[PDB]
Paper text:
To further characterize the binary I260Q complex, we solved the crystal structure of I260Q in complex with DNA. The dataset collected from a binary complex containing 0.2 M iodide in the cryoprotection reagent (2.25 Å) is the most isomorphous with the ternary I260Q model with dA in the templating position and dUMPNPP as the incoming nucleotide. Model building and refinement of this structure reveals that the I260Q binary complex more closely resembles a typical ternary (RMSD 0.49 Å) rather than a binary complex (RMSD 1.22 Å). Many of the residues that typically undergo movements in the transition from binary to ternary in the WT polymerase were found to already be in their ternary positions in the I260Q binary complex. In the I260Q binary complex, all hinge residues are found to exist in their typical ternary positions, with the exception of F272, which shifted only to an intermediate position due to the closing of the fingers domain. In the binary complex, the amino group of the Q260 side chain forms hydrogen bonds with the backbone carbonyls of E295 (in the fingers domain) and hinge-adjacent residue Q264, bringing both into their ternary positions. In the I260Q binary complex, the templating base has prematurely shifted into its ternary position, while the primer terminus undergoes a smaller shift but remains in a near-binary position. Finally, two additional hinge residues (L194 and Y265) also prematurely adopt their ternary conformations. We also demonstrate that the crystal structure of pol β I260Q assumes a closed fingers conformation in the absence of incoming nucleotide. Therefore, distances calculated from the steady-state FRET and the crystal structure support the presence of a closed binary state, which suggests that the ground state for nucleotide binding for I260Q is partially closed and that this conformation renders the enzyme defective in nucleotide discrimination.
Numbering used by the authors: 10 to 301, 304 to 335
DNA sequence: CCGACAGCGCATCAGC
DNA sequence: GCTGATGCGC
DNA sequence: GTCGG
C-alpha cells in the first residue's frame, strides 16, 4: 500500500477508541479516514494534503504530520505501554468478547490467553467457541479455499431443496483474493416479505451442512440468521484446514437486491452509502429502501442493485469497486 | 458552534 | 412468560 | 473525530 503506514496508524487508533475508550463514533471516524486514504492514489506528503480528503480533519492531519516526520506516533506509543489498554485490546480479539466484557474480565484478573483457557465456565457459548478457534479466526481465507467452500455449500443446499438459492457475498463476491469469512445469502420462494409458507428453512440447510461435517460449531442460531464455524475436508495424511467463520442469512426472496447489497459490503461502504442515503432523504437496510419529519415511509420498488444507487443519485458501482 | 454519526438479528438480563 | 434495554458482531 | 446546518 502507498500509505500503509498511515492507515495502520489510524486503524490502531480506531481499535483503541472502540475497545478501550468505547467511543464508537471515534472508531468509525478513524476507519472512514483510513479507508479514503487507502484509496488515495498518491503517496501522502503532508497532513494538509490528506485533510483535503473527506473524513480527514485537523486532528488526524496533525497525527499524519507527526508520523511522516518521525515514523511513529507518541499517542500510540503511550497506549501500547498501558497494561489495561493492552489487556483489553487482546481480550476483544476473542469473538464474543467486546469492550465491556473485556474490561470486566480484567477486573476479575482474567487478562491472558492462559487465563481464558482455565476459565471457560465464565464464558458464554459464543465466547467459548471464539476462544476455541482464537488462532484460526484471525487467519485469512484464500480465494481458492472460498471456491471449495462455495461449491460444498451450494451443492448441499441444492440437495435439500432445488428451489433454494445460496449466494456467497462479502469480499468474495467483490472478487477479493482473500476473505475474512464466508457470508452466505439464502433465499427460498416459500419465504417472502408477505408470508412464510414453510418453517425450518434455515434449520434444514444448517442440519445438512452439519451432516456432511462442514459446519462444526454454532455461535448463534435463529429463524433468519445463523452464525457458526465451518471447515474444509482434508485429504489423507494432510494437515487439516483452519476452522472458518461462516454466516448464513435467510433473506426474503422478493428483497434479494437490498440483501445482496448489504452482505456484499464492505462494512465501510455500507456505512458511507447509508449515510449518504440519509442526506438524500432515504433510509436503507438489508431489506428495503424508504424515504425519510424523520418518519420512514413505505418501501420503494427495487428491481436491481443499481436501482438503490439511482435513488440516492449515485453512479452504479460493481461489487469489485465496493472494497473500501 | 453543535447535533448527528447505518441498521439489525441473536444472546442475555432485569422488571413485572 | 412477556417486554424492553444491552452487549455483540457485521 | 469529522462534517453539515
Ligand atoms: Cl423495512
Ligand atoms: Na477533510
Ligand atoms: Na471480540
Amino acid at each position: 500500500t502507498l500509505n500503509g503506514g498511515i492507515t495502520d496508524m489510524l486503524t490502531e487508533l480506531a481499535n483503541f477508541e472502540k475497545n478501550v475508550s468505547q467511543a464508537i463514533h471515534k472508531y468509525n471516524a478513524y476507519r472512514k479516514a483510513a479507508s479514503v486514504i487507502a484509496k488515495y492514489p498518491h503517496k501522502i506528503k503532508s497532513g494538509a494534503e490528506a485533510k483535503k480528503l473527506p473524513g480527514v480533519g485537523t486532528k488526524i492531519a496533525e497525527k499524519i504530520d507527526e508520523f511522516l516526520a518521525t515514523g511513529k506516533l507518541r499517542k500510540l506509543e503511550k497506549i501500547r505501554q498501558d497494561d489495561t489498554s493492552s489487556s483489553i485490546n487482546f481480550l476483544t480479539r476473542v469473538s464474543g468478547i467486546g469492550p465491556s466484557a473485556a474490561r470486566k474480565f480484567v477486573d476479575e484478573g482474567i487478562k491472558t490467553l492462559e487465563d481464558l483457557r482455565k476459565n471457560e465456565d465464565k464464558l458464554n457459548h459464543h465466547q467459548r467457541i471464539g476462544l476455541k478457534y482464537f488462532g484460526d479466526f484471525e487467519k485469512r481465507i484464500p480465494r481458492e479455499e472460498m471456491l471449495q467452500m462455495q461449491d460444498i455449500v451450494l451443492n448441499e443446499v441444492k440437495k435439500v431443496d432445488s428451489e433454494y438459492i445460496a449466494t456467497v457475498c462479502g469480499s468474495f463476491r467483490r472478487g477479493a483474493e482473500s476473505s475474512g469469512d464466508m457470508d452466505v445469502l439464502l433465499t427460498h420462494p416459500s419465504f417472502t416479505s408477505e408470508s412464510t409458507k414453510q418453517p425450518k428453512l434455515l434449520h434444514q440447510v444448517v442440519e445438512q451442512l452439519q451432516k456432511v461435517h462442514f459446519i462444526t460449531d454454532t455461535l448463534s442460531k435463529g429463524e433468519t440468521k445463523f452464525m457458526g464455524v465451518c471447515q474444509l475436508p482434508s485429504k489423507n495424511d494432510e494437515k487439516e484446514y483452519p476452522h472458518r467463520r461462516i454466516d448464513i442469512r435467510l433473506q426474503p426472496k422478493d428483497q434479494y437486491y437490498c440483501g445482496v447489497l448489504y452482505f456484499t459490503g464492505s462494512d465501510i461502504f455500507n456505512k458511507n452509502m447509508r449515510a449518504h442515503a440519509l442526506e438524500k432523504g432515504f433510509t436503507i437496510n438489508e431489506y428495503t429502501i424508504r424515504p425519510l419529519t424523520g418518519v420512514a415511509g413505505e418501501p420503494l420498488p427495487v428491481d436491481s442493485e443499481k436501482d438503490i444507487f439511482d435513488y440516492i443519485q449515485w453512479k452504479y458501482r460493481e461489487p469489485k469497486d465496493r472494497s473500501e
